[PDB]
Design a protein around this nucleic acid. Structure first.
Ligand SMILES: Nc1ncnc2c1ncn2[C@@H]1O[C@H](CSCC[C@H](N)C(=O)O)[C@@H](O)[C@H]1O
Length: 327
DNA sequence: GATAGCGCTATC
DNA sequence: TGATAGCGCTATC
């Protein structure tokens, strides 16, 4: 994460739906806002949230009377994406895990928050020929909000990870917000090699495999792209090794492969997966953050979390645009 | 709840 | 195309 002094959102209240790790909280909180309610059903996710905020989120959002939700200004939600990711069987809304948006919608219709801030995977943009996006676009407009969306790729905002995501900011049609904009990109000057842990701490993640083939030679100079060096087995997901000189491929929640969820890296002549803390750092989490004691779960968690640094910017802009109230 | 080996699709 | 990537799917213990 990044430090911010113009706390644009001081005095605003926000809801953390599908809290997960709390990435949305950290982001908005670094701007001066305050989380008045949180929601996350996964037992383990609940454990870390509590471990890091002292609160335990409410359960299954689908069975929560919308009225029960407190007044709030900004609604934050990174709804489940398994049903829209390039990596899965794209069942979309037909999928049981693809209708949570409509849960967001019934929340918005009752509480009418000034802002709706959603997150999801890039393929969502084009899913079902973009019908999905369109369905969402329209649904929002009808509840009286302006729909603003773009696909930003973390590596353009200081984080050494090629995580391409769609971000959707919606404003109540009242407040004539007409100046909102998405953070301008900037030069990447921090790479994976700059986030790795001392070898002493990592050792146990190292993997020696004889079916390790080398498709390319290590690069000398830093590059803001995923430069793959090797393959293991059949080179499927989790079976590909990248250079610590480029940027980290998207971390995932349910991923498989010998280097499940983090992918493999050629660290100092050795081939290994990333340590939970390294995942955190790569997601732009402060080292102060407490990762879940169960590594498998820590991976899963960070895997479908969100790159804090980015939301930081967007939030600041969401703020900027809301404070411009001249005469 | 942990671990892995897959098999597909988008993008260009 | 031909090569890479993916907040994944699912069998097994
Ligand atoms: N019906 C539901 N009710 C509550 N939590 C749910 C849910 N369906 C999915 N979830 C939770 O939704 C989350 C989606 S991923 C969002 C993660 C969050 N932004 C963070 O920073 O990491 C997952 O943790 C999933 O367990």
């Amino acid at each position: 994460m990044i430090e911010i002094k113009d706390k644009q959102l001081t005095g605003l209240r926000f809801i953390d739906l599908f809290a997960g790790l709390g990435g949305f909280r950290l982001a908005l909180e670094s701007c001066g806002a305050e989380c008045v309610y949180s929601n996350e059903w996964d037992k383990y996710a609940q454990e870390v949230y509590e471990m890091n905020f002292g609160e335990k989120p409410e359960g299954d959002i689908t069975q929560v009377n919308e009225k029960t939700i407190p007044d709030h200004d900004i609604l934050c939600a990174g709804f489940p994406c398994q049903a829209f990711s390039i990596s899965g069987k794209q069942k979309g809304f037909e999928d049981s895990r693809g209708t949570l948006f409509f849960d967001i919608a019934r929340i918005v219709r009752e509480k009418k928050p000034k802002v709706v801030f959603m997150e999801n995977v890039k393929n969502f943009a084009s899913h079902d020929n973009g019908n999905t996006l369109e369905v969402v676009k329209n649904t929002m407009n009808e509840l009286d909000y302006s729909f603003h969306a773009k696909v930003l790729n973390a590596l353009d905002y200081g984080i050494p990870q090629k995580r391409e995501r769609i971000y959707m900011i919606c404003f109540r049609n009242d407040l004539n917000i007409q100046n909102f904009q998405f953070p301008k990109p900037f030069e990447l000057n921090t790479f994976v090699k700059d986030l790795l842990l001392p070898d002493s701490e990592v050792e146990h993640l190292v993997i020696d495999r004889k079916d390790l083939v080398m498709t390319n030679q290590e690069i000398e100079q830093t590059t803001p792209k995923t430069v793959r060096l090797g393959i293991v087995g059949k080179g499927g997901q989790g079976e590909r090794i990248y250079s610590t000189r480029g940027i980290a491929i998207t971390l995932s929640a349910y991923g498989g492969g010998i280097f499940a969820k983090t992918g493999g890296y050629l660290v100092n002549g050795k081939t290994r997966k990333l340590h939970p803390r390294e995942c955190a750092r790569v997601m732009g989490y402060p080292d102060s953050y407490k990762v879940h004691p169960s590594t498998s779960q820590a991976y899963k968690q960070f895997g479908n979390s969100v790159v804090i640094n980015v939301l930081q910017y967007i939030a600041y802009n969401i703020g900027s645009s809301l404070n411009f109230k001249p005469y």
